[PDB]
Amino acid sequence: SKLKPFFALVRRTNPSYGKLAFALALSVVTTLVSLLIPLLTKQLVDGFSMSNLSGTQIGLIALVFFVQAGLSAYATYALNYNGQKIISGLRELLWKKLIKLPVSYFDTNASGETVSRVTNDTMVVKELITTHISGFITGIISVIGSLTILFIMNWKLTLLVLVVVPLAALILVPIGRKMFSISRETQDETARFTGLLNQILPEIRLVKASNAEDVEYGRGKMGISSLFKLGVREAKVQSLVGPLISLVLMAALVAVIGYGGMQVSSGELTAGALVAFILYLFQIIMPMGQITTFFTQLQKSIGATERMIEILAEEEEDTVTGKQIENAHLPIQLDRVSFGYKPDQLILKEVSAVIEAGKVTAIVGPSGGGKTTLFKLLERFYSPTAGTIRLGDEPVDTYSLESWREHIGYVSQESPLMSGTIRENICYGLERDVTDAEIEKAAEMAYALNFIKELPNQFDTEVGERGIMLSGGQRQRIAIARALLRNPSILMLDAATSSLDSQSEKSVQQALEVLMEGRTTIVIAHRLSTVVDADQLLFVEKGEITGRGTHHELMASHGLYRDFAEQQLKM
């Protein structure tokens, strides 16, 4: 059944089903060659006297090894190469989907867990396909055909003793499991002792100050004594297991080998059959581990595939919405917007607001209310189900979300840089324009080129893999220049105006007030600089609008009664 999802995925990785079959059959004939190997040695033993035909048989055996090696090598290379093509396809599709579609909240599920899933689960799937789909088939064919050749070579003989030996081995194994259990308890208790020590040391200050080194020495002694008793336990078990292991194993080996010798010395027809038997039981034992490993890893592989298809399931979309985009200059309207999170959580309720077009307007929200949610609603990652943010007499959703975000003036103080150089900022500003060679021209025009440390270079200025060797204000003004470059039509502001002085704060304030004056400006912050800057301001509390109007007597009085208490809470 799970083969259905597994094959669905490998079908999503579409083009190598014939080469894989080639590889599998070549591996099969490889194992058959390995089966052949003993018999030529058997003939060699049969010759036994002269060197000429013995030399010919040596030639044959060397040739057959060489064929086995070459063909097996080709099979393995083909298998792994195809598998790496497969894994390339998997990662390509997965990354494409995972970046393109899934709107913000899904990556809100987790951060490192997703990329971890991708990496490790892809690796497991690939190793599975190539190594284990080889190994299981080759080994099972090997072992069944091998016991068959044993039946042919040996009757109701020294193959029966062989098959009863692992009976005793299975009787053996649980003893090793018990040893493993005691070992587990051992590192468990050692970790306990380590934790006790970790607790004790940092407070050595109070320990000494109390003159209580003696009771602590006693605590250590107790812990050590407990570890000592457990060590004695492990000792007893280890001693009664190990020699028992050696006993049973060596004894069974002696039984097998010496009973074969009993056959050969008796004149039974087993002397080159004996060398065949030893070689060939060797080839028998070699591949059992592969069988067991496949049996184990199948479960994890299938779970991984389930995870993969789960990640592939969900969907999102952006230009698909429409093309009804216009000049995008109209007041933003929130109409009875109640949609928040999952319809059963309901973090929002009927939130309605009117912000005039081309007007600087900020918001104020509580630390733990709905301010961040209203932020993510203005930036419109969430899909309003109950509420409606009115724009353009209801094409607000209808026109391309890509076109709308193409008008967005996104900015935030937290935002570091994408890895690389300064040019990549405007390359991100690319919208099939590339801004030609108006890139540095605009950098100059809007104050950005005046500022990145006298432009050490226009392209070689490496912003950093992470961006450490640059400060916050620098990157924030880089971003504001980027947004001014993109489209200076609709501006949002997280108000990246924090501790960047009174030089850079006013710098970005005039940047938004001059370059972005007539067009729409939206601010979200906590300080009074933004509330006095904005022409209109609204206030949000318990996930509901609780303030409106201009910001002079209105917001002063809004403060005075309750918002002043809120501010005093902030300080």
Added chain:
Amino acid sequence: SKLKPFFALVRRTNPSYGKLAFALALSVVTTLVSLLIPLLTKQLVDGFSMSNLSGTQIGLIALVFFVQAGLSAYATYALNYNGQKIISGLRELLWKKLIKLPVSYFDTNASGETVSRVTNDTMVVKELITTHISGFITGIISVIGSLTILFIMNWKLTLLVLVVVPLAALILVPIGRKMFSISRETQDETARFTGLLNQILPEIRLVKASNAEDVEYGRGKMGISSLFKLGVREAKVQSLVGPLISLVLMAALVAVIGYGGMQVSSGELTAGALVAFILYLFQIIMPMGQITTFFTQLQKSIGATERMIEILAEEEEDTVTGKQIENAHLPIQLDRVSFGYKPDQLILKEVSAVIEAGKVTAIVGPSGGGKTTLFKLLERFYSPTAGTIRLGDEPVDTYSLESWREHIGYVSQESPLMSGTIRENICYGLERDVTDAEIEKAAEMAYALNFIKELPNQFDTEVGERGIMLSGGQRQRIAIARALLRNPSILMLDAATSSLDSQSEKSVQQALEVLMEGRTTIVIAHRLSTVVDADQLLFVEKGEITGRGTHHELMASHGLYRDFAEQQLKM
């Protein structure tokens, strides 16, 4: 040479020599028995038909096996039991040392590395001693005896073949090493890709703002392409190495046992000898690897051995210093006190100050000032070298430090508590007095019976692993109450007064003041409650005494002014 420190440490262990000798000789006996084993099988197989007397012979085989197993078991039990005894001795010595002598500075080295040192190095030493000394002697004996009896068995034919086969194995090994290295290069690029994805992920919100989804899709595709490139090389190397490994190993084994069979059909010196040789050959594989293991872990542990003596190296002093402490109510004097963390560092320079008996004391310190080291040397954890700290005309260096230490009391900022219950703190308030059964009544006197009458249980109420069951305020109050009761002479702390408000702050302040109408106090906190409760107010700057005099006028003029007024403005 290094065996001399090894012997010195295990001599610090002391009682084991004879028992270890017994065990080692027993293991030698066992390995000789193992050598003996297959000769019995050879006698049996050369017996040959006539399973009757074969019964007696195989019974002799069985008894030899049984005595081998039992002797080996006793050997292993003795080895591990003794080794655990040495581990006990080491752990007790390290713990007694570490807790008792090392003054705070040795811990200021750092914390976690020391406990990791302890646990891991003890484990390594145990494993070394017992497993690897036994194994090294066992293996050398086994392999040498094996080669000798193999001489005596087949001479020039079998030994030459056997010796030359590991020659081809050594030919093999470097290719396996190269495969391993390329595999490591493989995980290197996997981690590179992982880090790229990790970096890009919050950059998903950034790019969804920035609309460069195709740009990042491309970035991921180049990353995947690089991984695919490397995978091709990994594939080629794996394909080359694998078949070559199988080739050499299987073909050489063919050579060996087939030459045996060639001889067998040759009617040379054969039959059970083949059966004998086979057993001996396996008698090599179990020992061989152990040699390798011993040849590594030793040096590992020997460094641990060095590490051990290093911790054992440090020495320190206590109550063997002397005894002169009895009223402990004389003014303390700081006379030219000049010693930082190290004489060369000179964090502290000739600081001189006066504190009269019973006077409250408050110390004002900056973040970068030597305020912490000043407090630590008041704790007398920083040994005076040049300067002199003396109350009672320099007995500080004559009487025992711990004596002054019970005569003083301390509580820190965080003020955690010993793992366990209420009994931890109160019983730590014991100095052979045992404080009868008034501990709870005294706690009541010190306003500590609040959480006695909480009473989840008087003694059974347990705080958890660390003590998170309680809160900062209640832990602070219980600890201070108990310790101040325990030590009513000098009184000292860093004022663990916090956001524990006005109820806890005032209550604990008045309680400690009740503890000290006739007792001396000193505080180095960073607020103003203790200073206005203090009659002398002092400041530290650059490891130098400044800002002395009475609180109100003198501090407002100079002490509480200057940088303190500056940071008050910063408040």
